[PDB]
Structure 1
Amino acid sequence: VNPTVFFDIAVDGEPLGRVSFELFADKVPKTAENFRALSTGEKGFGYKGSCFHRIIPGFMCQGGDFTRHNGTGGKSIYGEKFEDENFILKHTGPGILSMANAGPNTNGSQFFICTAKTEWLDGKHVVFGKVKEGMNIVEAMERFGSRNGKTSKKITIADCGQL
């Protein structure tokens, strides 16, 4: 039942590999649906062509700002922002897929993929999925990050959709 979505990642326009995610629609259906629909593009906007604007190795990779490409933009399928659905799931380790935000009830389209356990984010960012296949590609993406998060090459979602 839980949907699977994929990202095809490129590095300076060169294909790197595919990352796939299980979205926990059974526990966070509204949040999972937003990510699913942004991944297919079915509403007329979404993640295809967008970049990962911040990659901190040993922490996380952040993306999903498809309108300003720098962390200041993005929007949900429900409007500019939507509420924190619940905090049932925790940031348990690498691979966790979770919503980025600017405060309570400000979810849009930005998200992050954990590359470490980030337990201090529990109860503040809505976890809604996990990497299924392609964690090795996330690890490869991490090598283009830096301590301050600026990437050393452009890391893009060249294609995305639902499997």
Structure 2
Amino acid sequence: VNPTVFFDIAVDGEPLGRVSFELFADKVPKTAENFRALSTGEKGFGYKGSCFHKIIPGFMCQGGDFTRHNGTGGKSIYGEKFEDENFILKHTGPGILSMANAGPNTNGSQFFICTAKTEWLDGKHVVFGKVKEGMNIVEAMERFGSRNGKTSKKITIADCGQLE
């Protein structure tokens, strides 16, 4: 019953491929739900059209700032911010999907996809999903990043929604 959502990823507008994700609703219901809803855009805003504004090769690709596209924006579907649901799940390797934040209980809409084991984030970021299909696309994405996270082409979610 875990949901599956997808991003049609594009680079300066040119389709790269579809990545799909398993959201672990069975362990972090509220967090999975937030990402699911923002992927369908059913609440009237969401991820369609936003970019990955920070990609650091060999570390992670971060996105989800759909209000300001630069790491300052984003909102949850619950209000402005919500709490750390739990730290059951660990950053075990590439493909892990996890919440960006600015300290305890500051979950918005921003997230990142690990491109390695990043266990130093364990117990400080809530892990809630995993890539599933199209890890390779996220690897291709890694290559438009830089050591500081500035990206050298506009990597976008041209479309997104739920597959199941």
- Shorter-chain TM range is over 0.9
- Cα displacement (A) at 1:114: 0.1
> 1:32, 1:137 → 2: CA distance?
22
- Cα displacement (A) at 1:23: 0.2
TM norm structure 1? 1.00
> 2:47, 2:100 → 1: CA distance?
15
> 1:79, 1:114 → 2: CA distance?
26
Query: 3-state DSSP class of the match of 2:133?
Result: coil
Query: 3-state DSSP class of the match of 2:161?
Result: strand
1:66-111 alpha-carbon deviations (Å, 9 max, x no partner)? 0000000000000110000000000000000000000100000000
When the two chains are superposed, the root-mean-square deviation of aligned CA atoms in Å is: 0.3
Query: 3-state DSSP class of the match of 2:30?
Result: helix
> 2:69, 2:132 → 1: CA distance?
26
Give yes or no for the alignment of 1:117 onto 2:154.
no
Structure 2 unaligned regions, length at least 5: none
- Cα displacement (A) at 1:14: 0.7
- Cα displacement (A) at 1:131: 0.1
How many residue pairs end up in the alignment?
163
> 2:133, 2:77 → 1: CA distance?
26
Structure 1 unaligned regions, length at least 5: none
* 1:53 matched residue in structure 2: 53
- Cα displacement (A) at 1:123: 0.2
